[PDB]
Amino acid sequence: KFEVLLGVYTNAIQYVRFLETALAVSCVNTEFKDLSRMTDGKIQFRISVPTIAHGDGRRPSKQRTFIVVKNCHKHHISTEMELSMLDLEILHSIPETPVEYAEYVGAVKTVASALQFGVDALERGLINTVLSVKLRHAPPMFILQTLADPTFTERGFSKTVKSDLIAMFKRHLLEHSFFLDRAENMGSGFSQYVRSRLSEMVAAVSGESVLKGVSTYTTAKGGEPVGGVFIVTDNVLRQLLTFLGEEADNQIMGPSSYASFVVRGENLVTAVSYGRVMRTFEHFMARIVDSPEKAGSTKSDLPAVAAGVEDQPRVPISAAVIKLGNHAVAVESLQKMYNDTQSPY
Amino acid sequence: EVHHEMASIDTGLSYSSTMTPARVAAITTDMGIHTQDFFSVFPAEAFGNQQVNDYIKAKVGAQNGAPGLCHGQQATCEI
Amino acid sequence: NRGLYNMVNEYSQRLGGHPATSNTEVQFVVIAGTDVFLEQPCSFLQEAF
Amino acid sequence: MDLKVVVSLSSRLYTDEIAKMQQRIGCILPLASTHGTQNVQGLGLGQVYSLETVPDYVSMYNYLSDCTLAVLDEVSVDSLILTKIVPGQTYAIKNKYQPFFQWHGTGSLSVMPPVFGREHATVKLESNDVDIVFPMVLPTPIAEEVLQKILLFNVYSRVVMQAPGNADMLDVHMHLGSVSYLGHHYELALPEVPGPLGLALLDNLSLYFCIMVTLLPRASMRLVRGLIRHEHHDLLNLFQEMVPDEIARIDLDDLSVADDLSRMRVMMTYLQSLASLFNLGPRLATAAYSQETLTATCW
Amino acid sequence: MDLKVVVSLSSRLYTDEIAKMQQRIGCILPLASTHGTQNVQGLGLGQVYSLETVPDYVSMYNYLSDCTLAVLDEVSVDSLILTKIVPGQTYAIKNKYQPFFQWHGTGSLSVMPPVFGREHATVKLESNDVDIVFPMVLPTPIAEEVLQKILLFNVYSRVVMQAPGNADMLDVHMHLGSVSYLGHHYELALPEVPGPLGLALLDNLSLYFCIMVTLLPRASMRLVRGLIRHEHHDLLNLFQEMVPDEIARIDLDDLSVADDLSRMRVMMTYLQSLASLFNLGPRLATAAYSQETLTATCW
Amino acid sequence: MKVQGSVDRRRLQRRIAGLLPPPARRLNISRGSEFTRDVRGLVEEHAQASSLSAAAVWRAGLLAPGEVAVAGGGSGGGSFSWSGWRPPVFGDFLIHASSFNNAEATGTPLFQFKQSDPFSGVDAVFTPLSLFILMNGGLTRMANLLYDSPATLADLVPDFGRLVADRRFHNFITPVGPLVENIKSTYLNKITTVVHGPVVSKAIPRSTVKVTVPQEAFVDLDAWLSLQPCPADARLYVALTYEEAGPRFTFFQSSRGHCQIMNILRIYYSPSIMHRYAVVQPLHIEELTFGAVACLGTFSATDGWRRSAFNYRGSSLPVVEIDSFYSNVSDWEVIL
């Protein structure tokens, strides 16, 4: 008569890489080897705005230029692992007899997995940091909708304009919130209503971004450059799959590595002597002294505005997408990392 | 300790993301009539006569935990 | 009082002044929040329903 | 082994405050949690010391003796880099304080809440609406002297609460709130009403005192009476030709060496207990110092 | 790290002095400068204890708490090699001390200034015209016993020097000659007939303790009556009965408040200094001891 | 032209290349490799154990110049510390066969009581259980089950009744620390304990020792007392209290700092002093002293206390066990 150890199973941790998530559609990933040195970053836009001549005696507005400055923000990420000193001790000594060898291999396996956990925790940290940064600059919908409309700000922000905008805000708050809740009573207009709501969400966000012309993530099907990313929980993703029915493509095409930034060259001298390092010192020297006369052209600027984003080869990212209006938009669920780490979504 | 650093820049100039509520899943505050205790808010304040103060404290119900909560998180009420 | 764009940025970016705690028997104030994700729409509008 | 803490600020601070903090490089300050990533709230001595609140110094000593101590290493627009002080290390440390006192290199330093001033010691950060307070370090003798000043002022502000006139509290303010160092006087900011933890400490002092007062040896009293009656010493400068009335009443019993000896034994057994209580703060021993560098090798 | 110090000499040694430094080879010395090669004038207590001066006990204790200890390694013609003490490293020590005391394992060793005559602690070197003084090591219990007994001996000798009708020197020498500890007895020789001026190494510690015990009764009652509060520590009310009735009957009012505060202040300074003095700060553990080798593995 | 007086040229560089290197920290990680000789060299803890051979010992490097075992021969020795690592100091006591019960928890704290006989050769030891029995849940039950015939204990202490009346019994005890090894002999037991350093057992198959104290005796000082910070080190204290029924023995654990520890011990003993010093007993010179407090060392905070059964002869005791202890004894401080 005996008792039987009839099964031994161990869970396996799947690697989660930032580039494989659909969320990475909404970012530009630069590999900058020594980030700790950069004290502060800076981006300066210069925009020229024209006016239209008028026959009235009206006083005219002169030539208009605006100078916009944006700055980097840094993030620190850290995790703690614990190792039993006995394991780190027996790892050095050679094995004497096969039981010592069995204990040695068990020890090195344990410590290796203890480090696997660490690298995995840091990757989940990267992805959570990007998601939180995106959440910090995402104003709510009922404020965005009437502000995207240029019809209500045509004459600028006086008193009465704002007194009416607050009314539109409170009204959209009372009416259009929890739309996927209202779909049940809305009934047969369910699909068209959800489509119009998602399309209002899409059109509300401004699309004027400097890197718009660069060849970012594309549809797996030829053409149709992907426009953006939805992030939803699993239940709402199921409801969206039901109402939208068929999905568009089921996979997309994205880059395989991050664009490297190297401080080599005379940027090294400008970093030794001075605090500043100039980006794209090749083109920036060429524009001033090498080719001072010629005026810039967008086609001549496009190879410059992508430092290393362009050269990379593309591979199929697995992510669910749809097509709405004229835009291919991926819909992505992350509520599998936050469940497994057992942190709130 | 495993460390990492990151750097972020907003690319464009306007708002580039929109969050919005889609579906209510639960209502937590019980939407009750629990009134906030001013006596526990101000433990210094008191009337003149000591026994009058103590009798008012006895009749008003002034002062824990609650053993079991049928609805959920109680929401204070103010008058 | 400030411009409404600065207020819109502050809405989603920085949390509201002294909101209620969550998953507690009663409603305390939350002075330092750990994984607290609430936001309130009444603060900027200054109304109640 | 590796001692390093980076403290991450949520929003970038302005130029004025980055300059004010870069003046502050090389500062001792307590943080609460021993991790590589620390929030801006747990930093500094601020969260216990408030602008609106009455200053209580013993509670700040209490908070500081428990919070881990670190040295300011680097100031940035978003991140503060501070090295941690482990109990078992040697640290090259820098002295630049505004209320500066000279350093021997012989005696251990001590850390204390900012008794001298609040404004010149604080740094406000309105970018992140938080206030940082740098505690003050001193050589041990002046530290113990200031502590004695503060406690005696607590007791005498309490007692003269029921006293006749202003001149008496004015005499109390002289040579209690003021620390007189070579070439200057320095004004300690003192509470008008000390109510928390002043009791909890002075009461233990009173317990020790009332226990010790029973078992005094009489031979010392007789000796002091004889010496103040005949000779004059700088330690005997206090008693004039007058001799106090308590001693004249306690002395009268004869001398037995056995009882005085046992009393001396017990009094020593209590003095060593009394010595432990006066510290209430971290003590950093110093081995070497350079006046041209204002740099010690503390331990 | 490598910690060995070498003291060279101006001139060559005599044979007698070579034997005399072979005598106390495995013992403890204060070393003024931590540097590797050093002169002779900084390895002893001659700066602290001299024939020409009159020594002061608080001074010697201050120097003992602020110096780096060391153990000899090798005595050679024209050179000496010691091993430096660093906190947190193990050493082996011998007991070569002219007043002998038994050592017991797992005890507490204490480095207190050598209170006895020169001939028990000093070692004379005429080739360079110096005298090296060795700090006496002692098991901590006996270290406190001898301290208190010689202090009370000085108290009573000075008392009977003032007024003869107070004591009998026979009783003093009977109750304060011997020290019994751990089943051994050690009879210590008191320094007879202390001179009128403070020519004894003691008598300053004695004045400090005497000022303290004379100022304690005025201070303790004022502190207790000041600490009376609507709320206070509960044991205080029960321990207010401990004070003798004679001390209770004192009217707290004195010649002035300022004098009372100055008395409190100086008394408290003396109390803290003395409380630090009785701890016998430089202290060492002991792991094992062998009597035929006379060796203790300490740290 | 080349005089070459000093020997520093072409020679001192080799010496400083050995005296040069510090131990490594902050090793950078590549994802794809995920494991290298670099990470292993950062990881290896470099133990100290004998293989009982010439070549094997010299490879293990036990014949190390510094206090720590360093391998590689010439390559080693340049660590210059291991975060201030100090090898444990050991203490070896000789015990009668009846005083210390042969079955013990191997991490129990010990105490040596000084005797009076001159030039002695044996010295006494006690554990908290024998210490209980000497002073006269089911701590009483199991303490009786382990130790019978208190006379065999009382003979080592002929002054117990006198010292507990003169309040001097506390100074005679010196705390030693946790156990390490017990060598059982018919007539004289050989006890090996550890002082002033890590508590790690000597068994050649490496095993962990956690210091255990009976849960009856242990008193969590921080619990019943009440944003607040948290330090890494929490100290462990013993308290010997002369109570009316007799002397009693308790433990405490806290990180509040010395002054706060004193104050919380004051209010923790307040009712007992209120009862004892009261009408029941008046004052006298030698009776004033009440309690003694001594520190036993530091333990990693936030771990806490595992609660374990200690089983002897089919009877259990609830015992708090503390991992990763660091033994460090302190003097006795008088409390009243």
Short mmCIF file of C-alpha atoms in Angstrom, two decimals, chain D residues 106-107 144-145 147-149 152 155-156 158-160 168 171-172 174-176 195 199 202-207 209-214 216-217 219-224 226-227 230 233-236 238-240 244-247 249-250 255-258 260-261 264-265 267-268 271-272 274-276 278-279 299, chain E residues 66 87 144-145 147-149 151-152 155-156 158-159 162 166-167 171-172 175-176 204 207-218 220 222-224 226-229 231-233 235-236 239-240 242-244 246-247 249-250 257-258 260-272 274-276 278-279:
data_model
loop_
_atom_site.label_atom_id
_atom_site.label_comp_id
_atom_site.label_asym_id
_atom_site.label_seq_id
_atom_site.Cartn_x
_atom_site.Cartn_y
_atom_site.Cartn_z
CA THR D 106 38.27 65.92 18.94
CA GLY D 107 34.65 65.62 20.07
CA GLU D 144 24.17 69.59 25.75
CA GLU D 145 24.29 73.24 26.81
CA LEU D 147 19.38 71.24 25.62
CA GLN D 148 19.81 72.29 29.24
CA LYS D 149 18.87 75.86 28.28
CA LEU D 152 15.17 74.90 32.19
CA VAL D 155 10.25 74.68 33.69
CA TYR D 156 10.68 78.36 34.46
CA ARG D 158 5.79 77.12 33.55
CA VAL D 159 6.57 78.33 37.07
CA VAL D 160 6.63 82.09 36.40
CA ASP D 168 11.39 88.13 36.60
CA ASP D 171 15.75 87.82 33.99
CA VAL D 172 14.74 84.34 32.83
CA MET D 174 18.70 86.60 29.89
CA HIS D 175 21.16 83.69 29.79
CA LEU D 176 18.56 81.08 28.99
CA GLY D 195 3.10 71.42 26.80
CA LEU D 199 6.35 66.94 30.92
CA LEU D 202 11.12 66.57 33.10
CA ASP D 203 8.99 64.13 35.11
CA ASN D 204 11.56 61.37 34.66
CA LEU D 205 14.20 63.89 35.66
CA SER D 206 12.19 64.59 38.81
CA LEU D 207 11.82 60.89 39.58
CA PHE D 209 16.18 63.51 41.44
CA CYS D 210 13.73 62.61 44.20
CA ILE D 211 15.20 59.11 44.34
CA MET D 212 18.77 60.40 44.57
CA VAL D 213 18.00 63.12 47.11
CA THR D 214 17.32 60.62 49.91
CA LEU D 216 23.15 61.72 49.86
CA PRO D 217 26.42 61.22 51.80
CA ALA D 219 30.60 63.89 54.67
CA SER D 220 30.39 65.89 51.45
CA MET D 221 28.00 68.34 53.10
CA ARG D 222 30.30 68.79 56.09
CA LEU D 223 33.27 69.29 53.79
CA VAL D 224 31.46 71.93 51.73
CA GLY D 226 33.97 73.82 56.15
CA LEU D 227 35.47 74.90 52.84
CA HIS D 230 37.35 78.90 55.43
CA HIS D 233 37.43 78.45 45.19
CA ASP D 234 35.96 79.24 41.79
CA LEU D 235 33.62 76.29 42.17
CA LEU D 236 32.84 77.70 45.63
CA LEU D 238 28.47 80.65 44.20
CA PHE D 239 28.16 80.32 47.97
CA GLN D 240 29.27 83.56 49.57
CA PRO D 244 22.70 77.49 53.00
CA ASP D 245 20.08 76.46 55.54
CA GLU D 246 19.36 72.97 54.20
CA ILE D 247 22.90 71.79 54.83
CA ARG D 249 19.82 70.99 59.08
CA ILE D 250 20.95 67.82 57.30
CA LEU D 255 29.62 60.10 60.16
CA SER D 256 29.64 56.35 59.61
CA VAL D 257 31.78 55.21 56.71
CA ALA D 258 29.76 52.08 55.90
CA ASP D 260 28.13 56.70 53.27
CA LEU D 261 29.94 54.04 51.24
CA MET D 264 27.88 56.24 47.23
CA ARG D 265 27.51 52.86 45.53
CA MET D 267 24.23 56.94 43.83
CA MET D 268 26.74 55.77 41.23
CA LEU D 271 24.19 58.35 37.84
CA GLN D 272 25.00 55.97 34.99
CA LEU D 274 20.88 59.43 34.37
CA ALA D 275 23.70 59.84 31.83
CA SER D 276 21.88 57.85 29.15
CA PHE D 278 20.54 63.48 28.35
CA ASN D 279 21.48 62.61 24.77
CA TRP D 299 32.42 58.24 12.00
CA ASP E 66 39.69 61.50 22.82
CA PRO E 87 36.77 49.77 16.61
CA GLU E 144 34.20 51.60 39.72
CA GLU E 145 34.81 50.24 43.23
CA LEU E 147 37.14 54.99 42.02
CA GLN E 148 34.40 55.44 44.61
CA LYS E 149 36.55 54.22 47.49
CA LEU E 151 37.04 59.40 46.26
CA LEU E 152 35.45 58.83 49.66
CA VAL E 155 36.58 63.26 51.10
CA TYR E 156 37.14 62.00 54.63
CA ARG E 158 40.07 66.44 53.68
CA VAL E 159 37.16 66.54 56.14
CA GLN E 162 39.43 70.75 58.18
CA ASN E 166 34.59 64.41 62.89
CA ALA E 167 36.22 61.05 62.10
CA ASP E 171 37.86 53.59 60.65
CA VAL E 172 38.55 55.16 57.26
CA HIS E 175 36.48 50.46 55.66
CA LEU E 176 38.25 51.83 52.57
CA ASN E 204 38.87 68.11 41.83
CA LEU E 207 34.84 69.19 44.59
CA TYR E 208 32.65 68.58 41.54
CA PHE E 209 30.67 65.83 43.24
CA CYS E 210 30.45 67.84 46.46
CA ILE E 211 29.11 70.94 44.73
CA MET E 212 26.62 68.64 43.02
CA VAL E 213 25.33 66.96 46.17
CA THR E 214 25.14 70.28 47.98
CA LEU E 215 23.14 71.94 45.19
CA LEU E 216 20.85 68.94 44.64
CA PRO E 217 18.35 69.60 47.50
CA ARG E 218 17.52 73.16 46.41
CA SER E 220 15.06 68.83 43.18
CA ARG E 222 11.96 73.33 42.90
CA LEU E 223 11.82 71.01 39.90
CA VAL E 224 9.13 68.84 41.49
CA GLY E 226 7.39 73.27 39.03
CA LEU E 227 6.36 70.07 37.28
CA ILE E 228 3.04 69.91 39.14
CA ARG E 229 0.48 69.95 36.36
CA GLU E 231 -1.87 66.02 34.06
CA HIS E 232 1.52 64.47 34.76
CA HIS E 233 3.24 61.12 35.16
CA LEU E 235 4.41 57.59 39.53
CA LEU E 236 5.46 61.14 40.44
CA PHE E 239 7.46 59.18 44.69
CA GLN E 240 6.85 62.65 46.11
CA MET E 242 10.20 59.60 49.21
CA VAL E 243 11.75 62.99 49.92
CA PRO E 244 12.72 63.49 53.59
CA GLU E 246 13.29 68.24 56.22
CA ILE E 247 13.78 68.77 52.49
CA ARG E 249 9.74 72.01 54.50
CA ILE E 250 11.85 74.41 52.40
CA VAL E 257 15.11 83.92 41.06
CA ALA E 258 18.26 84.67 39.06
CA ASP E 260 18.20 80.04 41.83
CA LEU E 261 18.43 79.65 38.05
CA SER E 262 22.22 80.03 38.04
CA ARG E 263 22.49 77.39 40.76
CA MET E 264 20.24 75.02 38.81
CA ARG E 265 22.27 75.64 35.66
CA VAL E 266 25.75 75.08 37.08
CA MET E 267 24.52 72.08 39.07
CA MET E 268 23.01 70.50 35.97
CA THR E 269 26.22 71.01 34.01
CA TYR E 270 28.18 69.34 36.80
CA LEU E 271 25.64 66.53 36.97
CA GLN E 272 25.94 65.74 33.28
CA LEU E 274 29.89 63.58 36.34
CA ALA E 275 27.35 61.17 34.88
CA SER E 276 29.55 60.85 31.82
CA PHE E 278 31.17 57.43 35.97
CA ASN E 279 30.45 55.45 32.80
#
